[PDB]
């Protein structure tokens, strides 16, 4: 390897335009990976009834099927004050909620 005036110029140019630092020493030839890092550091400058589109407010959102499939829609019924519907609110959330602790 060499450290002539052209070596520092090409190194700075290749560090500025953008390229992997590991391949920088291989493209220059001779210089190792540790040398280029030290140079740059030393020198600096380092089905339902609604699809996924027609989903309005106060509607069911329980998915049916596979999203990566052909037919994937939601229920889309009267499901205000809740994301899911009443028919699925009891199957989604923990049924028979019985939990308590100290406070």
Partner 1 sequence: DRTDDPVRMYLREMGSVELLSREGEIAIAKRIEAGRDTMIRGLCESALTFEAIMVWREELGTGRILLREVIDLEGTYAAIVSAMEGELREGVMAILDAIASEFEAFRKLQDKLVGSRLKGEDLSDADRKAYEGLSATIIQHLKTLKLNNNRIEALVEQLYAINKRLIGLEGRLLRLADSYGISRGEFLKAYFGSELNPTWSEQVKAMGVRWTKFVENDSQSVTDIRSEIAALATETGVPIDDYRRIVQTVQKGEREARQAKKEMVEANLRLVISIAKKYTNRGLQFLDLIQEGNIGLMKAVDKFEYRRGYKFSTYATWWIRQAITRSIADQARTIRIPVHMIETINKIVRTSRQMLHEIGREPTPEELAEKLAMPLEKVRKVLKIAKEPISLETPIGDEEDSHLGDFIEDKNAILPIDAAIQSNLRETTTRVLASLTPREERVLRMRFGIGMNTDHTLEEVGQQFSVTRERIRQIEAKALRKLKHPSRSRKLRSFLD
| Residue ranges that bind partner 1, judged by CB under 8 A | 19, 52-53, 55, 61-63, 66-68, 72, 83-84, 88, 91-94, 97, 103
Residue 88 annotated as lining a ligand binding site: yes
Query: Binding string, 33-72, against Zn ion, x = CB under 5 A?
Result: ---------------------------x-x----------
Q: Are 79 and 87 in contact (CB under 8 A)?
A: no
Which residues lie below 8 Å from residue 74, measured CB to CB, with a gap of 6+? 48, 50, 51, 52, 55, 59, 60, 61, 62, 63, 64
Nearer to partner 1 (CB atom), residue 9 or residue 54 = 54
Q: Is 75 in the site for Zn ion (CB under 5 A)?
A: yes
91 binds, among partner 1, Zn ion, none (CB under 5 to 8 A by kind): partner 1
3-state secondary structure of 92: helix
Contact assessment for residue 48 and residue 17, using Cβ atoms and an 8 Å cutoff: no
């Amino acid at each position: 390897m060499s450290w002539t005036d052209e070596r520092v110029s090409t190194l700075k140019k290749l560090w500025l335009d953008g390229l992997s630092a590991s391949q920088i020493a291989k493209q220059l030839g001779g210089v190792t990976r540790n040398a280029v890092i030290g140079k740059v550091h030393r020198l600096g400058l380092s089905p339902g009834s609604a699809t996924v589109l027609t989903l309005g407010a106060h509607m069911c959102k329980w998915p049916i099927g596979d999203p990566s499939s052909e037919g994937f829609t939601f229920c889309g019924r009267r499901s205000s004050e809740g994301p899911y519907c009443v028919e699925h609110a009891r199957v989604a959330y923990q049924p028979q909620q019985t939990k308590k602790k100290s406070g």
